[PDB]
């Protein structure tokens, strides 16, 4: 299914952004410090989120919560099982044609689970 090199790149990004907690600030500051504007803008358009300028209605977020267990995600982040977390949210993304930067996408999905779950 998922290419393991992309899984590990996503897991490493999650580990770096969220080493000190899954927070909106840690996500946005990590993304703005590590990705080009163009890459960020593509994710913002795909997910209808604002990253480069808590819980409000979002299409994709609701479909994410209907398919993927919030409890499974939060447990993975609690244990710092970042590659477990990555495969779980990447399975949702590839299914739904979320083809923008997988590290940013995974970061946003993990944030949604923790801050909105």
Numbering used by the authors: 58 to 110, 126 to 189
Quoted passage from the original study:
In previous work, we described the inhibition of Candida albicans virulence following exposure to the 68 amino acid bacteriocin, EntV, secreted by Enterococcus faecalis. The protein is further cleaved in half by the extracellular protease GelE, generating the active form of EntV which comprises the 68 amino acid C-terminus.
Unprocessed EntV136 was recombinantly purified from an E. coli strain as a selenomethionine-derivatized protein and crystallized. The predicted disulfide bond between C106 and C167 was not observed in the structure due to the necessity of producing the protein under reducing conditions in the E. coli cytosol. However, the two cysteine residues are co-localized within 3.4 Å, consistent with the ability to form an intramolecular disulfide bond. The first three helices are in the N-terminus of EntV whereas the second three are part of the C-terminus. The two palms enclose a final C-terminal helix, α7. α7 itself is strongly hydrophobic, as 11 of its 16 residues are hydrophobic sidechains.
